[PDB]
Amino acid sequence: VNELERINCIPDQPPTKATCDQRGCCWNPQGAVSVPWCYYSKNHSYHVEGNLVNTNAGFTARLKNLPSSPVFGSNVDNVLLTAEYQTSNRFHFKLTDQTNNRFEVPHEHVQSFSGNAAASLTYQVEISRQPFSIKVTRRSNNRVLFDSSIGPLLFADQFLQLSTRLPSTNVYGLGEHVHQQYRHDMNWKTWPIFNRDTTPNGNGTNLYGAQTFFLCLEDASGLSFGVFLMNSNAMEVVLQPAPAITYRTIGGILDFYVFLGNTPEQVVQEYLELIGRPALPSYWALGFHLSRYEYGTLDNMREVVERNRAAQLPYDVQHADIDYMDERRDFTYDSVDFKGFPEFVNELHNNGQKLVIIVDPAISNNSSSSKPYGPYDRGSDMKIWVNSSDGVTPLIGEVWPGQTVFPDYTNPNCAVWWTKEFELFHNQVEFDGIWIDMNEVSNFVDGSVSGCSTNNLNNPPFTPRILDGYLFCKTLCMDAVQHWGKQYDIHNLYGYSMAVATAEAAKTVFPNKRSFILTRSTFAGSGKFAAHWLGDNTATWDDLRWSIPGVLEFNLFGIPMVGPDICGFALDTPEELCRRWMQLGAFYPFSRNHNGQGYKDQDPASFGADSLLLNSSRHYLNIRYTLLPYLYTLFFRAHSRGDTVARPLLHEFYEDNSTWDVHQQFLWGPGLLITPVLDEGAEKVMAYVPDAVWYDYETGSQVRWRKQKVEMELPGDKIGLHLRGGYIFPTQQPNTTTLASRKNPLGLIIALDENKEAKGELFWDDGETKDTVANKVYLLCEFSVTQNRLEVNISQSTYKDPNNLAFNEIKILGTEEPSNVTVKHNGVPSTSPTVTYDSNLKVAIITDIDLLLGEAYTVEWAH
Ligand SMILES: *[C@@H]1O[C@H](CO)[C@@H](O[C@@H]2O[C@H](CO)[C@@H](O)[C@H](O)[C@H]2NC(C)=O)[C@H](O)[C@H]1NC(C)=O
Ligand SMILES: *[C@@H]1O[C@H](CO)[C@@H](O[C@H]2O[C@H](CO)[C@@H](O)[C@H](O)[C@H]2NC(C)=O)[C@H](O)[C@H]1NC(C)=O
Ligand SMILES: [O-]S([O-])([O-])O[C@@H](CO)[C@H](O)C[S@+]1C[C@@H](O)[C@H](O)[C@H]1CO
Ligand SMILES: *[C@@H]1O[C@H](CO)[C@@H](O)[C@H](O)[C@H]1NC(C)=O
Incomplete structure (x- = not known):
């Protein structure tokens, strides 16, 4: 065995020989760092029983387990492989329990396949029986794309695992994480996925969303493929230098899709065709957005609005965070500190601007006859809350307003309740769009106010390397109960379901309009309903640099309208960092300057009416706005065809292997190259100029550079912008x-x-x-x-x-x-x-x- 191909058989604990022997695995401590000391043997998993059976869609096979005794719970002895040749460029296969029905994601867009195997396949599938493996090869050149033979299939009730070899190390995708680089270099790395309120920092934890898709550029010809796993259980994805990837999930089924394309862009299109293409945004939402946590008062908010308008900043949208509420409660405003809120919204609308309000899922349960809270009252009458494991008592947690109950957005009646809450609020405060936050769902207590019972859901046999190492950490009990099922299975779908609901609400509140929805938590397919921001970042140069791969990755995921908090949410922002962040920020598909509670002002005009930061900001925002018909047309193509909007160089320049790990630059669509300064003190950036004619946007002059690294000279007031010939x-x-x-x-x-x-x-x-x-x-x-x-x-x-x-x-x-x-x-x-x-x-x-x-x-x- 080449040690780079060893599949780790003790993912749960430090390796020992006793455990190795007990699990029937191979022991060889004599590797390099991270090389598994304990690894699966060549032959000990499933085998095909009997013959494959042709079906209308494809084929099925019966897989049977060669007896190994319980490790991570009850093993599945008889597995069914169902394979469907759904289109020429999309292969679907699922591995299920032959004898028992198991949880399957109730996705809103993806449909079950009926009818016949596609003609003219670009791929071919080969199955081996002893032991079982599945291989998907490209027909045109026989390149092996998916090949599970590197490792076993493991299929227990709470531990499912499948690996595949990969034809290259040009691997992009997975989320939601801070990867720091765009390309995964494929050296030993585990990425946990389980929606969680947590800081996007250098620790590489699970974050707000769950995104299993990755795209692989096979070679310089552009030929690429993608893999998506339709599973919403806690999971982790293990990369190794073989190169190979392993998916290890603690529930549901292994439901895989493989997509082939001639270009990386075609692989994204094929993925989005399955899961759903992004909503076309309101044109106003492509403008610049300004926000902060705790203006505290309307007077304060107005002062910020007015100084940035005084400065002639391009500025379409004002967000209002939980400080507008009466004591951080949904569907109220503070009649004292936000007295005159309705008049302010009129002022926004009259200046051609828009108001987006934050709405949290969690609803205060503090309602009496003296002091009624209507959303809680009405939600309770309609019985639309997430229940504790008894299936009848609403689960109690704690968020901004105090003790709370949580809407069950998987129940169709909940969206009716949610819609009515927004129609009532909108009669008071005429907001134009909605920012849904804290929807992981995020809880200030672990599980619930009375904690969580000890059982196999709250305390599973195997827990991926999620932050803090318990599933119910800062969220709901895993045995909490919703219309779609238990929280263990659908936790990752909460924010997805909330966006679906909120979109249903927009049908009524904003008749025949798109409006705007921005969401924190996402699942595959959330871009059909919402924009995304990359969460609670920090005002550091690292965060600035890390923003780009995050933006690119969400584009691959079909949420193209994405950006961070420009200038950094947490911490006072330095002027030079904020100035470089606003230059780059003028070119994020979602452009919002947002700031945390207490920190100094970071809205552009707060730096001074005649500051270089304001001057530069207004200059580059006016370029952004000049180019909005180009950007809008890119969103039209994302919505109707599935193209990316913020695009990696490699998608246009894959023939050139120098582009394959460029992550400090990106494109708008095919033609606009953006080169920010991302280093403190720098007045130059180290950039790659791809193999095309390039013109400096401002002057129109053709650069000398072509297909080479350059030191691009970029003074305090400049970001690199070049147009492709x-x-x-x-x-x-x-x-x-x-x-x-x-x-x-x-x-x-x-x-x-x-x-x-x-x-x-x-x-x-x-x-x-x-x-x-x-x-x-x-x-x-x-x-x-x-x-x-x-x-x-x-x-x-x-x-x-x-x-x-x-x-x-x-x-x-x-x-x-x-x-x-x-x-x-x-x-x-x-x-x-x-x-x-x-x-x-x-x-x-x-x-x-x-x-x-x-x-x-x-x-x-x-x-
Ligand atoms: C959560 O618990 C409530 C009860 O507190 C359940 O409410 C039921 O709702 C339906 C209408 O949708 C009624 O026909 C039942 O009579 C209600 N039960 C009672 C006793 O009030 C709700 O279904 C539960 N939710 C989940 C996901 O199980
Ligand atoms: C930008 O939009 C403003 C509206 O905010 C336009 O403002 C003016 O337009 C007319 C002059 O052509 C005046 O008669 C309006 O009263 C006036 N309104 C204002 C400034 O409040 C302005 O023309 C637009 N400019 C550009 C470059 O398009
Ligand atoms: O650290 S702190 O700001 O207190 O809380 C964070 C961790 O739970 C929350 O995600 C902040 S929420 C998300 C942020 O965009 C909002 O401005 C905050 C108020 O609505
Ligand atoms: C990792 O998390 C800790 C808090 O647990 C934090 O202080 C630290 O800065 C993080 N590390 C990196 C590399 O950002």
Whole structure:
């Protein structure tokens, strides 16, 4: 045995020979660090009994256990393998108890498969019988993608395990964690997954969400595949240098999906097709958001709002944290410190801004006849709470307002209660979106106010390496009871179910609008309902650096609208760190400056009306807003096709192995390269310039760099922004809110490639109505440039913006002097455009032009 292939047979304790012998494993302490001293033997697990049986969907096999006696609970003697050739690029297999029904995730989007095995498979599946293994290979080149033969299948009631070899160490995904790097280097590492309120720091613990998907770039040709495990039980994922990955879960079933694609982007598309593509956001939600924990008073909140508006900061959304509530209670505001809250919301709305309020799941149980609490009263009447293990008494915990009960969002009647609570609150306070927090679910006591009973759910035979080492730590008892089942099985689905419910609520509170939902806890598929933020970070340079892989990973997960708390939640932020964080933060898909209780102000204007931080912030936010039609079109593609929005370099440049672990840079879509300074004291960054033509966004000049590391010079007031040759970027003159910006002239930036060609597109709809894509009420155009000619082509035209919008400026990068510029509208010349040329920089700008949005044009020139 090569020691890098050993599968650890004592994951639970320090290795000893007595235990090894007792478990039938192999003993060989003579390895390197982390190499398992005790590991599974070549032949001792399951075997196929009899023949495989062809089915309409695929095949089944009966697997039978070669007798080994109880280690982590009751073992499953007879396992059923069910395999389905669901599509040409998606393989599904599950391992279940032949004789007993077990918990299976009640996912809201994923459906059971009916009908027939797909034609034209890109993959082939091979099963071995003695012992059992399953292998998925790519048909085109026979590359083995999934191969469980490296280790056993373990299948006990509370311990299920399967391993697979991997064809490369280009592995990305898993969550929710702070991985620090984007690529998993595959040296020995265990990642626990169990939704938990915990700090995203350098310790690598389980965090708020549960995301089992990973993507593997097989080679430089771009060929890639992905694996997803549909299991909501506590689990851990073990990486080793074979290279190989092992999934080790303490409940449910092994329900796997394998996705193949020609590019990493196609693997993401295949995954999102299964689990659900992200919601198209409200266009306003792409603006800058400002927030903090404890303004304390409305007067304080208004002062912050007003100084940032005074500074002309692009600034669409104000969040209001639990300090707006009457004693941290949902669906109230503090009639004293937040006296006049309704008038403030009118002021926000009148300035074209939006209000997002925090809502916690936990409901105060403190209600009397003297002092009634309506949400508790109504929730109790409807009987919609999570119950203790008796199945009838609501479970009591403790969160912000004190003792609380917790909504059971898995019960359809709960969402009716939840909706009515929001419709009543909204009559008082006209919020525009909802921030759901503390939904792991997070509890200030362990399990409940009376703790947890000792039993196999609260105290299982095996516990993954979760923070604090008990399942019920800072959450509900594992034997608590909900409509979908016991908390042991569905704990990881609480935040998911809460987002589903909250989205159901938005149907009523915000009729036919998308609104905005931001969630802390997530499961696979939560991006269909909500944005995400990366949680309670800290104002340190480490946190700044760690933000990028977090953003990228959530994009792979189909939650593209993601960002951290810009400047850092915990701690006073240093000015230089906040300045570099706001530069980068202008380019996070979800851009929010948020701050913890007590710390100094970190809103941009608090640094001074004439500070470099404010100046720089406003400069880069105005760039963000200029480019919002490009960003919005990227979200349209994420929603309708499944593309990422914040994208790793390797997704566009996989042919170049220098891009495979770049994590200090990223792209917006295919064309915009963002290079932040992420080091204290630095005025340069060490960056990689991929193999393309690149133009400096601000000046339009073509960089000398191509396919190389560079020291990019970036002074206190600069972040690197380069546009890729071959791409056309739609823009719109910025303003301080998107309500206003969306009325402005549009522009095109044409970044020419080596052949003087470029392509791009623009999606445009009303920016807020739900189902504009489903109901095909939108504009989609395509731009293409070939040497002497720009064509504006209209592929869908069922929305005409009433603001009479037009392209009034075209900037061409990397061009020789155009001359004789002519504009035609469906063939008819022409109106005679002004052209300015910079011969040194090779930039042409065409003005005094009026190309109506939604109309076909040709713009032609000579050299
Ligand atoms: C939690 O306990 C309550 C009782 O406290 C259960 O409420 C039942 O709800 C249905 C209507 O949905 C009624 O028909 C039953 O009569 C209720 N029970 C009683 C005795 O009041 C609720 O079902 C429990 N929840 C779970 C998930 O088991
Ligand atoms: C940005 O939006 C503001 C609204 O906040 C626009 O404000 C002005 O627009 C008109 C001038 O063309 C005035 O007649 C309005 O009264 C005025 N409103 C204000 C400032 O409160 C402004 O034009 C927009 N600017 C850009 C660059 O688009
Ligand atoms: O450390 S402390 O801030 O007190 O509490 C954290 C640990 O439980 C919570 O997650 C903070 S919550 C999440 C944070 O975005 C909100 O601003 C806080 C108030 O709603
Ligand atoms: C790990 O957690 C501890 C608290 O238990 C914290 O003080 C420490 O800073 C963390 N370590 C890292 C590497 O961030």
